[PDB]
Write a protein that binds this ligand. Sequence first.
Ligand SMILES: NC(=O)c1ccc[n+]([C@@H]2O[C@H](COP(=O)([O-])OP(=O)(O)OC[C@H]3O[C@@H](n4cnc5c(N)ncnc54)[C@H](OP(=O)(O)O)[C@@H]3O)[C@@H](O)[C@H]2O)c1
Ligand SMILES: NC(=O)c1ccc[n+]([C@@H]2O[C@H](COP(=O)([O-])OP(=O)(O)OC[C@H]3O[C@@H](n4cnc5c(N)ncnc54)[C@H](OP(=O)(O)O)[C@@H]3O)[C@@H](O)[C@H]2O)c1
Ligand SMILES: NC(=O)c1ccc[n+]([C@@H]2O[C@H](COP(=O)([O-])OP(=O)(O)OC[C@H]3O[C@@H](n4cnc5c(N)ncnc54)[C@H](OP(=O)(O)O)[C@@H]3O)[C@@H](O)[C@H]2O)c1
Ligand SMILES: NC(=O)c1ccc[n+]([C@@H]2O[C@H](COP(=O)([O-])OP(=O)(O)OC[C@H]3O[C@@H](n4cnc5c(N)ncnc54)[C@H](OP(=O)(O)O)[C@@H]3O)[C@@H](O)[C@H]2O)c1
Lengths: 258, 253, 253, 258
Amino acid sequence: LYFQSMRLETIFGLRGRTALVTGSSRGIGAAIAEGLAGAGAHVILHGVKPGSTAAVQQRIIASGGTAQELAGDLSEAGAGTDLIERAEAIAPVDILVINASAQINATLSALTPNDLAFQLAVNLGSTVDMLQSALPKMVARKWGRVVSIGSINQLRPKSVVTAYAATKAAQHNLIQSQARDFAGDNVLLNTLAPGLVDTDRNADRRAQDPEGWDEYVRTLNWMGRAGRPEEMVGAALFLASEACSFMTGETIFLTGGY
Amino acid sequence: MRLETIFGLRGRTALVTGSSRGIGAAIAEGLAGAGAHVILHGVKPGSTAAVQQRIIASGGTAQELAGDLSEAGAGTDLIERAEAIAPVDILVINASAQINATLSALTPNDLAFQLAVNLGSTVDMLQSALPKMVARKWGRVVSIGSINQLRPKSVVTAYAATKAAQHNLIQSQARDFAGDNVLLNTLAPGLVDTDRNADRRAQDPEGWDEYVRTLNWMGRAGRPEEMVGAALFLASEACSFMTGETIFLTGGY
Amino acid sequence: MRLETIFGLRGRTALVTGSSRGIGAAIAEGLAGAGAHVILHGVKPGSTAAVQQRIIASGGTAQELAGDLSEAGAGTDLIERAEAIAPVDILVINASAQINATLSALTPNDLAFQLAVNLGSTVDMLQSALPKMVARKWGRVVSIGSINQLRPKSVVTAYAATKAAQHNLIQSQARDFAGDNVLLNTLAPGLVDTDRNADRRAQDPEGWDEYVRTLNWMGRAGRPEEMVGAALFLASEACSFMTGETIFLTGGY
Amino acid sequence: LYFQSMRLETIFGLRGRTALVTGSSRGIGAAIAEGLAGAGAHVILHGVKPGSTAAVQQRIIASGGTAQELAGDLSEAGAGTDLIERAEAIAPVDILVINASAQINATLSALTPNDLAFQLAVNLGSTVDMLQSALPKMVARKWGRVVSIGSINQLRPKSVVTAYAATKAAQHNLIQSQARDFAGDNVLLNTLAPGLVDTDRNADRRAQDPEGWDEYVRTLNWMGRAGRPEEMVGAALFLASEACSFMTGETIFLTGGY
Ligand SMILES: NC(=O)c1ccc[n+]([C@@H]2O[C@H](COP(=O)([O-])OP(=O)(O)OC[C@H]3O[C@@H](n4cnc5c(N)ncnc54)[C@H](OP(=O)(O)O)[C@@H]3O)[C@@H](O)[C@H]2O)c1
Ligand SMILES: NC(=O)c1ccc[n+]([C@@H]2O[C@H](COP(=O)([O-])OP(=O)(O)OC[C@H]3O[C@@H](n4cnc5c(N)ncnc54)[C@H](OP(=O)(O)O)[C@@H]3O)[C@@H](O)[C@H]2O)c1
Ligand SMILES: NC(=O)c1ccc[n+]([C@@H]2O[C@H](COP(=O)([O-])OP(=O)(O)OC[C@H]3O[C@@H](n4cnc5c(N)ncnc54)[C@H](OP(=O)(O)O)[C@@H]3O)[C@@H](O)[C@H]2O)c1
Ligand SMILES: NC(=O)c1ccc[n+]([C@@H]2O[C@H](COP(=O)([O-])OP(=O)(O)OC[C@H]3O[C@@H](n4cnc5c(N)ncnc54)[C@H](OP(=O)(O)O)[C@@H]3O)[C@@H](O)[C@H]2O)c1
């Protein structure tokens, strides 16, 4: 009962809050989802197909947390709106982690109309839709957290991911304009922008080409290595909790130094 | 080291989107005054007649290509048409769509329209123009950005996000083609007196004066002509060691 | 993935400069609450007695090293003294000097004093501490910066410039020692209620309320305790893939 | 007499203005000084020892411009104040190019008290002093331009130049706080920040080690080359003239892409 101000549970604890984490079936979203549940949030997991989140759900339950799934392809018109509405019908959504994204590599000469539109639909379109449904609901409850997963490419882009990088820049810009609008309602939005992280998106290459991969990562960033998904978790807990009550519209870069 | 030797554009050709009026018009006349042949552009045929007349009157040369940049493939068609007239050395990406709306009033149609013009036609123009510039081993893109690309206000939620994506494209392509002398940079204005705000300005001058007084450190809106020096710098040999960057002309902000 | 497993500091030792009160005091108590042994610091012996008492009262451990960081070599002496007590794993560079003055009222003495504390002692502490941390293959520096390091106001002309230099040191050293797991980052607050502004605040509450209302997007000053989560993040395993960066806690700005 | 608005001479012309360019005996300062005189400014040249600016002065004169020298070591206390006062006794100083700087390479472990203090004295100390004397004088005349020469190291520093980089960050911060104060008086301050440029500071290395140097510059920046001093000139003319009338407190980075 005394000196409560300074405890980890007071600062980062999420008991009584609910988080929706898009693309939490695996990778960074899965790590973040487990971390959030670890701090006490009830977590609504999401993936494209029904049942894709089963393994993460069971890890959350086995660690004494609670979680359930909502599935859906975010490339579909209105999908972001519908996801929020379904999540809200389960419980008030206090925390939204915008993690699922589309990425098709191509330099400008290889960028097709289809690929550009798909990456916009998922990365910008569904983001606009989810914020449009979720933010008024958080504003009405006077508390909200959006943790948008961005990328070092939002700030220093490489043409190998031309379109994706451009959608990540637009996405953070949304986080900024809305943070400015709703800060006074305790509805805060920030971006967590990773550099290179070991996930499925590169699982195959690592396994098939260790020599190359190591020479590449060695001069990519100051640590000379890829990050692990679990290394995103602290920053996500910070951005999802009372701990960031005086921070909004900002980006935390986790790039291994870059 | 005469001004002409630093910023001169004799022998170059520039395409300036949205050069019928406002910032694009001032830029077009500046480029033509530095010696560029200028291809002017606006939505409808004849929209650029006045700027063309002023360029010719001052001893420069110019002609018009019109087209609505919101239509699918319009950027590609525009560059192809301009290239059939002459090598396009300098591309000024100035025309843009802006529909004011906070997030609650942002419709999918309005979002799609702003994307089509601000990002869609930009991608299409660069996809067509950059390879031509690279083969010639010289090129300049001057993308007209906005302070909202960096510190956005929700009153232009969608437009601000498109300007952030557009500058990101400028950076990724700058990084690819710098070794070919094909340079891309953003000129990002703060508030500038144009038609886009003539209506507010005419309509509540006190409300307006009071908003500009505290907007930026100079307490005023910029004039389209104050964009021109910067455009000349980014369009010429002068910026030969500069690429992927942004010049902010915001009155101090 | 318990909070304790992510942010826990059992077995680590932290030195927090200027932990007698304000932001440094809150940070010290937070670190001690996460399990760090904390070495507290203030200008004069006994200045940190209260924070030490609260740490011990909540089950943590702490002790004091005092010293004026404006004196030549003081940063070096401070680190050497702390290292003779235990390995210093975490260095929080919080104490700073701030003498308000616009450029016309900036004296060479005031400039030298702010440089000596804000940059001089920082260089000396890092010069002494970093090699020790590197040899142990783990280290954290949490430099307390300021929004003025990035968007300065002339009312703190000299102080703002020192905070910009200090963050630059953080970045150059981060880049050198990242491969050794010795990480350095800046926590940069906007306006926070401390003693440094208790006097204004007590003295013209309307003038004050009116200035904070429009200062940042939340329209309020932060509390020292709102710095603590961020300090814990930057002081622990949690920031293992983050270095050379800045966390801005400004209320939105 | 018609369409004057759009001419190069109107936009960038400096007839009737006077510029003081520190460290203009050679390198970037010399190129900038000649460019300014080329646009019509009367240029006060500066170097450490009397007569160090003689060759640049004669190039300026031979091209039909005017220039004269003021010499002095900026590491001395009060040197910046005294330089401005001497320049003002020649003519009102409309344009100040803060180009001379001290640079002694050292990582943190090799940084000595003497070297740190010297680099502060020149890069920060004399900068504070010159701005302190010059700005009120420009404010009284309702027109002024400060073009501060910074460095890519002000933003992304390398430890090989630890102290220097830190002084360049502080220096740009001064440019910002003062720009904000005096914008309303048409007294504008901006930073021109070069990346790697061929000057005397590396003249010896280039000449003695061409193979190494070329491999190094090839992956340094996106152009794969060092800049030339004359490539700073356009940006300096822009920042010194009517052309930047709506720009203050900003940095132009000339780094070859970085
Ligand atoms: N990995 C990196 O190096 C890296 C670096 C910087 C930024 N990031 C960003 O971090 C976030 C997560 O990356 P990651 O590497 O963890 O991705 P990942 O492992 O490939 O997983 C992506 C997740 O998003 C979901 N998803 C993908 N496409 C979708 C669609 N059209 N509709 C709905 N859901 C979809 C997937 O669901 P299913 O499991 O059902 O397919 C999956 O759960 C992304 O925003 C990414 O841009 C990653
Ligand atoms: N004004 C400001 O305060 C401000 C601030 C920051 C950034 N900017 C940026 O500066 C640039 C120019 O702005 P401005 O205020 O000078 O604009 P403006 O006065 O409204 O003129 C816009 C120009 O773009 C053309 N245009 C508009 N929509 C088009 C479409 N769908 N297809 C083809 N052409 C189209 C117009 O052609 P028609 O004449 O045929 O209609 C006109 O020539 C824009 O990129 C804007 O975003 C402006
Ligand atoms: N408060 C704000 O609004 C704000 C905003 C942005 C950044 N910051 C930064 O946050 C940090 C802490 O600020 P604060 O407002 O909490 O400060 P504060 O309440 O004034 O406390 C300052 C602490 O630093 C110590 N200190 C001051 N001068 C010293 C010297 N010459 N030698 C040794 N120790 C010295 C003091 O020791 P004694 O108790 O012995 O005097 C005290 O413990 C500073 O780096 C400040 O620049 C503050
Ligand atoms: N070269 C690069 O790659 C590079 C990159 C980024 C930034 N910069 C910056 O650009 C500016 C010019 O660089 P540079 O390479 O042209 O330098 P430089 O060729 O070595 O010449 C420096 C000039 O400054 C003067 N100077 C040096 N120390 C001085 C002192 N203590 N007091 C008074 N004057 C002094 C010198 O006068 P004397 O001739 O009498 O010695 C000389 O005219 C500097 O601010 C530098 O930091 C350069």
